[model samples]
Target: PFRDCADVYQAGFNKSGIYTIYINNMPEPKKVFCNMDVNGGGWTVIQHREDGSLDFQRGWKEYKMGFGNPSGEYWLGNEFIFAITSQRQYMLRIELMDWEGNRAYSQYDRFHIGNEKQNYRLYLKGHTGTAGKQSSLILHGADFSTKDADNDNCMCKCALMLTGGWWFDACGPSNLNGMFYTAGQNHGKLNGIKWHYFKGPSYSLRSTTMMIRPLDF
Candidate 1:
């Protein structure tokens, strides 16, 4: 038995890797269980004894852990992985989830993970107030450094993955839920790719396949 949601019987496994399913109830309940089926059709129904629950599980977290390929992957479902690449068109983004489970994908703590050595001072909304996402040509001093974490906000643009499978800026998250993103016709944060068939069947991007981004459970 696994997770109070599924049970397996050995009476079904043949020389082939396929197994059979058996349930305890007279009829199956409304809410059932499943496996991560991203590799086309390789879903694991007969989960190991010590397996994950809710079809989603995170293993570990670390830092500075890229093997020359700085790209990373965030999984949305069984088959979709949003790849965070280092291409110039796409800057690096760190989406933050608040205690309320509300995420600031374009807001919250942000910084452009660029190789620009000159800008290592780390801009936060550090010295100013309301500089906004598209605000340009603003003066810097107290807000340009981490001296104050609140007023110094990040200034570099972001990229986003929109419909049909291409990256484009100039879109704002002004509608559909409390998406508090501030974008202009000229700027954006990090670009994200839709997971499957370039559609909305995904809720997360790949977080493993590469690079230095780490998430904690």
Candidate 2:
């Protein structure tokens, strides 16, 4: 008696409980996802439009906080401390500059910041514009001569799970749009001063993008 005659109970699908019920029904990061639309020449970033793209909806891919005015096109030193914290028990700091620029830092600090909220993202894939803008730098992972199964449209654990936090199989390949991109994720990384992974949509060269925010208490 499996709980007293539970009528017709048709059961067969349990793909990890439907991916934990779609990651517990997603949507709750409030709003924020960055991809800094790059078209070439230096990384002084701040975007929503102007071509760099992210139509995930939520006021057109949310990026409202502060900073980015060291004289135009987005500039305020070190990616402008990541588009203003917003606030929410916040404690996430990231700094990475490679391709011989050499700089690496990652954080998750918060002893007391208030409100208590944290959810940010980044991912980038290899990009190439015939060697322009520091050659647009590209370093992360998953490029096994382009992977297998006739390429499976292209998938590498959401682009190698952003900065080695770890990832390799979420049914792998073909989800970054025409080819996905991100900073593990959000176009995860493209060159020096890096990050990578890519969701879908928004393309120029190679295609891969990611960055997300919303920490306001």
Candidate 3:
């Protein structure tokens, strides 16, 4: 049986669109928005943020099960993510766009996530992309954190202060789930959808999408 979008692409689906994927142990398949146009296709979107249409300041359960429309800005859920990445080797691609229309991308050759009992910890390796060369901004082994459930290593809950759920350690240099702000409102604060290596902490990006694919795909 096909496991994820990478499998779907291998089956000859050339167009990017909504697709269903079967995960191990799940009785029902999960729907995901796939990007078949960029980076050789086969990229399954795990998270997307564009406009402020959807409120991202969420709780633990919401982040666990996921929320928002797959066709638009949404998080494809931590549990589903674990299921997909844990099954095999995967690559992560983070595409970013600024209000000025500039674009950049950051990718990891190896990526995976721990189970919920591990607080959905993040694991990344072999970073390469146009976005940045520094790996300092990336929290390689950081655990996911939310306002209601603080799993970060920091004493102060970063999500509560940053206004979005993310993998944080002593706070973050990258937080794609932060508050949505207009270009003019981007005041260089620790808060805001940020990728420090791209435009620093204060400037909130206009759009960002996190996608993953099987390494060999």
Cα TM-score per model: 0.18, 0.19, 0.96
Q: What is the lDDT of every predicted structure here? A: 0.20, 0.22, 0.87
**After superposition, which runs of candidate 2 have C-alpha atoms over 4 Å from their true positions?**
1-87, 98-103, 111-217
Q: What is the lDDT of residue 104 in candidate 1?
A: 33
Q: Extract clashing residue pairs from model 3.
A: 188-202
List per-candidate RMSD values in Å: 19.2, 20.1, 1.3
What are the per-residue Cα lDDT tens digits for candidate 1 across 101-202? 433322212222222232222222322112124322121322211112112233422211222111111222211111122212112312222222111222
Distance from true location, Cα of 213 in model 3, Å: 0.4
Q: Per-residue lDDT of 1-217 in model 2, one digit per residue for the tens?
A: 1110011011322111101111112232111222222221111122211112332111101222222221221211111222232222333333333223333333332311111121122223333222222212122222211121111123453322321111123423222212223333333332111222221122212322222222231
Question: What are the runs in model 3 whose C-alpha is more than 4 Å off?
Answer: 136-139
lDDT of 1: 0.20
Give Cα distance to truth, residue 21, candidate 2, Å: 26
Residue 62 local lDDT, model 1: 12
Evaluate model 3: give its TM-score.
Answer: 0.96
Q: Rank by TM-score, highest first.
A: 3, 2, 1
Off by over 4 Å in 1: 1-87, 107-217
